[PDB]
Amino acid sequence: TLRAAVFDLDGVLALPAVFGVLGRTEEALALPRGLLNDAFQKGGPEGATTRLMKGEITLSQWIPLMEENCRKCSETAKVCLPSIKEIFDKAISARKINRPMLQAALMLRKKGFTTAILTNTWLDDRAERDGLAQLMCELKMHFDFLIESCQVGMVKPEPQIYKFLLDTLKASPSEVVFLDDIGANLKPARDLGMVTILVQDTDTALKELEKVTGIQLLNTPAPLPTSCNPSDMSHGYVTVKPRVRLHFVELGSGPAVCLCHGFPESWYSWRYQIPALAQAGYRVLAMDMKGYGESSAPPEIEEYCMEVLCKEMVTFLDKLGLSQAVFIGHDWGGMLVWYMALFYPERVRAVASLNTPFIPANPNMSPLESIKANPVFDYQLYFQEPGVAEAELEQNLSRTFKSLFRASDESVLSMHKVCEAGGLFVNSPEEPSLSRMVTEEEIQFYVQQFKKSGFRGPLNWYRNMERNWKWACKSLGRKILIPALMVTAEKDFVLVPQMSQHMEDWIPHLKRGHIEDCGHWTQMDKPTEVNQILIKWLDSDARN
Amino acid sequence: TLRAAVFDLDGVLALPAVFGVLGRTEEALALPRGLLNDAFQKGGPEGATTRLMKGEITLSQWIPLMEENCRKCSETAKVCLPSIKEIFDKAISARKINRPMLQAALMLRKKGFTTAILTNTWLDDRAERDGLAQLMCELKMHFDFLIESCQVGMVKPEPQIYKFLLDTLKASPSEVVFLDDIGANLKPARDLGMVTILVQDTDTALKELEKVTGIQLLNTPAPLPTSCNPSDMSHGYVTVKPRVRLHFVELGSGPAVCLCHGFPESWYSWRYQIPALAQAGYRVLAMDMKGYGESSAPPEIEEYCMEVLCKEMVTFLDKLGLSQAVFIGHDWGGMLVWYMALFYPERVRAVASLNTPFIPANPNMSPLESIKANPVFDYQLYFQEPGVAEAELEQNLSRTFKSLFRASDESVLSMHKVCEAGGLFVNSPEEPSLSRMVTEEEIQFYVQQFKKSGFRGPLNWYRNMERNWKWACKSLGRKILIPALMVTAEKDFVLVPQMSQHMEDWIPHLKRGHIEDCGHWTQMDKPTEVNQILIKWLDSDARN
Ligand SMILES: c1cc(-c2cc(NCC3CCCCC3)n[nH]2)ccn1
Ligand SMILES: c1cc(-c2cc(NCC3CCCCC3)n[nH]2)ccn1
């Protein structure tokens, strides 16, 4: 019975095979067939290529040796040579991840398999090495082990590397599927009793793989974007003032992108966006907003007014030494980011909001008058009195998050007449069913985060209506003229798409995105669609 | 008696004044004198410029209004106009920090003064706003307060802004020196009883300033590069494996630069380099190396061999989502970075070492034979036996750090015959004098860091001689062909400059730096010189 799957890199997890460039170069340069491939393997076990693959020498040292081998071969075949570096730079550059092969490895691992990459590779010291470094980073994170010939000083098809593989997997050979594009490198695994698959075209190899494992790997749905394992992330902490520290998770390099969650959420609400945005070439900073998770939660209502929250986010940038960040918010975080754009445009590279529209303050109406008007905002009046909503939300955390985090068709709450009914969960189940958007483990993460500070700080975001209104009136003569994106969600019944209809009057150059069949919890409801919209916008309007 | 100093931005802390571009543009475009300056102030208290300075409108909204004002003025003066945006983009871009003025503010603050910037400024939403954002960030960090007209909705010369200034300073007017380049903006401070200085040329203003404060500000020495306040930094934590977490301090944006300290140090040993490198356009990651400070310190000797330390630094990069970093090391950190370059060139953008040379393993001699040969390395044999050096170094932490951290002429230790004498501090004072390189507060920081784990993990770096030798022999056929810098220190009597004499044989393209009258503690001994060498090298060989 199988419990381990091993994949080669070149011609299996990454295509086209860098091997398959010597053949194409021969064809393109009208050189004798197999001339370059024979120069590459010249000397066999003691040749320059084996020394490279075992880590004895680096790629830049190997280039001149491959060059002499090519001359020696052209002399014997009685032919004239017309740059090995250019050939290899182009071949490595063209090699991209084989997405259906990676998808199969991901599924096997999701089903309990131990997965590994076993590869004959080199120590790359070329000026262009970063490309390969990026490829290896993207791939390796999805596997339990990465065994590289140049690091272990052993090469396929030597028998020692297969014994080393079995030792690292902690598995007997019959428990292992081994996939390779080189039949000779497949032979020692077969001899040991491993299931072996010779990879030519991906589809056929995956058919052989699903047949031998009994798991559907081809024609399969989805899947969801890569998520975050909280214990595997870099966690950052900045003191913005004596009693206030902000926590964030950080991933990637490039322009800084600050993600700001809503109520009652976490940095973890961006779990599907963090790996995608970092892979797209951005430095992601996913915040625990003030009052949440590992960030400080002072009890005072006034600590949560927009003017202080924005001032603190500017201090956060100052302490990290960032002159700007792109700010992307959702829900309350979306309101924060529009106010960052209005009050601190010099610090905001670009602004995006999910669901939350930009609506200016009405100087002729109190915020309470504006709230009472729309029946959907009744729960907000319930949130005003300190202690009342805290008690209901804190009473059973698992129930709170399971009742809240639901898709549009899983509706368990009716936010109209919340005050009259006397609560959010008054006619809601004690033991709600788990939404299709979340796992039990994901709910328990929110439960654990909320055990530290509870709901006082988060609910305080709603208790500064008058204060926020007075501050926002100072901006009534301004327009938002920095790059901006508004993303509406068709089925968010609180932050309806129509509420954004007048935004062009204040943000003339506004760009838009729209997600169909998407409820309030945008990032987890439609993560693939969110990622597509944000990456497209960042690349065109934000930079690097 | 003075205790507060207030500086204007334009024409005081930053030069040339953006104001002084309308005059130069008039001259360059043969327009009537004062035409642009009158269009800029048109309407006075209710004109477009006052609305801009109070934060009513943004800079991009003000541009077309200044444009109409210029047309109205050209019509009246009966002249023909030949782009306001281009004029202002160029003026803001040319404006740089007035270094002697900033130096004076730094000295006043070092002497106990409360310092502030009070400025008439705008909300900058131009595509080029980052330049100004960068300038404000650099300046603001050196002051207690930054009061901007567009954020407070008040403008100089209105009396309210001066009362607001006094309220924020918590000072009576006679306790305040106010420096400005506009006499009209100086008038209300004088009327209130503040000492006022009209700034034309810097030198004269500083002469007036030192006369009124009684502090030497002109012709003064140094000073030292900006240092780090540990509580003001962003602190990051990454779990590299179950029982090992690495702590780092992070500052800046740009290419990642990983700083690796030596024995027995801290991330804080790079305090003078962190702000300088971040200001130069780099993302600095200053590590607490394994065994130190807030990083994990497992007791096992083998946890500190170079192969595992390097593997962990690669995992650190993987978890932060960094395909590469430039690695800069000192002492033991310098040995680590050369091995990162040899074993993981794809992950190393460039490598630099302070003091520590790259010397290959001798396959014909045991590391203990090589150590016993050089009398200066005798203390290393003393470090071998677990517990012995730990007890001596842990007995009195203040004494340990005060005895170690000394300039070349302050020599209190003699590392020859350490074993024979029976310790590092056997003929060293119990209460050493404080070196001129460090403050008492800086020593207490190291003392506090070492209270957590002690010296077991740090000394374990020396207890893997055989293990490190076997691993290093695997690299004997390689060369370091990625960008590399070797910085020698003239007066380091352990890591002597001559020990680096053969490095070109292994690193043919090696670049060098050399610091005269510099001992072992390079970063704190000669911080200005270290910064100059590293920034010059990073900008030419590392990138952004
Ligand atoms: C104004 C109101 C809001 C807002 C969002 C929100 N979300 C929390 C709510 C979502 C649906 C279930 C009940 C809790 N409540 N108020 C956000 C930004 N500006
Ligand atoms: C080999 C030895 C060393 C080395 C540095 C060092 N520094 C600690 C030492 C400095 C002078 C005072 C006594 C402690 N000891 N051994 C560093 C890198 N490779």
| B235: its two tokens | 């602190």
Q: Is B5's C-beta closer than 6 angstroms to any atom of ligand 2?
A: no
| Distance between CA atoms of residues A61 and B507, nearest Å | 12
| B252: its two tokens | 């800046």
Ligand 1 binding residues, C-beta < 6 A: A 262-263, 331-332, 335, 356, 379, 404, 494, 520
Whether B46 is covered by a domain: the verdict is yes
Instruction: Answer positive or negative: Cα dihedral of B156, B157, B159, B162.
Output: positive
- Are B373 and B443 contained in the same domain? yes
- Are B416 and B455 contained in the same domain? yes
Q: For residue A346, which residues of chain B lie inside 8 Å, CB to CB? A: 123-125, 129-130, 132-133, 136
- Are A421 and A498 contained in the same domain? yes
Distance A495 CA to ligand 1 centre (A): 8
- Are B508 and B489 contained in the same domain? yes
- Are A189 and A278 contained in the same domain? no
- Is A330 among the catalytic positions? no
Cis peptide before A264 (omega within 30 of 0): yes
Whether B222 is covered by a domain: the verdict is no
Q: Which member of A331, A378, A525, A541 is catalytic?
A: A331
| B399: its two tokens | 């004494």
Bridge partners of A256? Answer: A283
* Strand bridging mode B244-251 / A145-148: unpaired
| A128: its two tokens | 């262009």
* Closest ligand by atom to B333 CA: 2
Contact check, Cβ <8 Å, B323/A133: yes
Q: Three-class SS of residue B115?
A: strand
- Are B323 and B425 contained in the same domain? yes
| B219: its two tokens | 């012709």
Pocket test for ligand 1, best of A494, A500, A503 (most atoms within 8 A of CB): A494
DSSP-derived letter for residue B520 is S
| Distance between CA atoms of residues A96 and A131, nearest Å | 10
User: Smallest Cα–Cα separation from A253: which of B127, B130, B322?
Assistant: B322
The CATH number given to whatever domain includes residue B37 is 1.10.150.240
| Distance between CA atoms of residues B62 and B124, nearest Å | 10
Per the structure, the count of domains in chain A is 3
User: Smallest Cα–Cα separation from A465: which of A539, A402, A383, A398?
Assistant: A383
Within 8 A by CB and 6+ apart from A395, the residues are none
| B326: its two tokens | 């430039």
| C-alpha to C-alpha distances, A539 to A61, A150, A532, B126, B128, nearest whole angstrom | 37, 36, 11, 19, 18
**Elucidation technique:** X-ray
Note whether A127 and A162 are within 8 A (CB).
no
Whether B227 is covered by a domain: the verdict is no
- Are A476 and A421 contained in the same domain? yes
The domain boundary, picked from B31, B62, B93, lies at B93
Query: What's at A217, amino acid-wise?
Result: L
DSSP-assigned letters across all residues of A116-128: EEEE------STT
- Are B88 and B188 contained in the same domain? no
The CATH number given to whatever domain includes residue A359 is 3.40.50.1820
Residue count of chain A, please give it.
544
How do the residues of chain B divide into helix, strand and coil, expressed in percent and rounded to 5?
A: 45, 15, 40
Whether A225 is covered by a domain: the verdict is no
User: Smallest Cα–Cα separation from B405: which of B369, B367, B433, B376?
Assistant: B433
| Distance between CA atoms of residues A45 and A54, nearest Å | 10
The domain boundary, picked from B93, B117, B149, lies at B93
Q: Within 13 Å, how many C-alpha atoms sit on residue A183's CB side?
A: 1
User: Smallest Cα–Cα separation from B379: which of B358, B407, B404, B401?
Assistant: B404
Q: Containing domain of residue A161, as a range?
A: 1-16+94-214
- Are A469 and A336 contained in the same domain? yes
- Are B210 and B256 contained in the same domain? no
Q: Three-class SS of residue A329?
A: strand
| Distance between CA atoms of residues A351 and A329, nearest Å | 8
| B55: its two tokens | 């934060």
Distance B332 CA to ligand 2 centre (A): 7
| Distance between CA atoms of residues B506 and B510, nearest Å | 9
CB atoms within 10 A of CB A309: 23
Q: For residue A140, which residues of chain B lie inside 8 Å, CB to CB? A: 318
| Distance between CA atoms of residues B161 and A49, nearest Å | 74
Instruction: Answer positive or negative: Cα dihedral of A314, A317, A322, A327.
Output: negative
Instruction: Answer positive or negative: Cα dihedral of B103, B104, B106, B110.
Output: positive
**Active site members of B:** 331, 462, 520
Whether A259 is covered by a domain: the verdict is yes
Whether B109 is covered by a domain: the verdict is yes
Residue count of chain B, please give it.
544
Q: Does B472 touch chain A (CB under 8 A)?
A: no
| Distance between CA atoms of residues A427 and A412, nearest Å | 9
Backbone dihedral angles phi then psi of residue A362, each to the nearest 5 degrees:
-95, 110
- Are A2 and A42 contained in the same domain? no
Contact check, Cβ <8 Å, B320/A250: yes
User: Smallest Cα–Cα separation from B266: which of B354, B331, B358?
Assistant: B331
User: Smallest Cα–Cα separation from A527: which of A168, A183, A223?
Assistant: A223
| Distance between CA atoms of residues A58 and B482, nearest Å | 11
| A216: its two tokens | 């559907």
Q: Which residue has the tokens 């019944």?
A: A493
Instruction: Answer positive or negative: Cα dihedral of B269, B270, B275, B276.
Output: positive
The CATH number given to whatever domain includes residue A115 is 3.40.50.1000
- Are B165 and B306 contained in the same domain? no
Whether B225 is covered by a domain: the verdict is no
Task: Please classify residue A281 by burial: count the beta carbons closer than 10 Å to its beta carbon, then call 0-12 exposed, 13-18 middle and 19+ buried.
Answer: middle
Pocket test for ligand 1, best of A495, A518, A524 (most atoms within 8 A of CB): A495
Whether A98 is covered by a domain: the verdict is yes
Is B181 known as a binding-site position?
yes
The domain boundary, picked from B43, B74, B93, lies at B93
Note whether A348 and A325 are within 8 A (CB).
yes
Within 8 A by CB and 6+ apart from B167, the residues are none
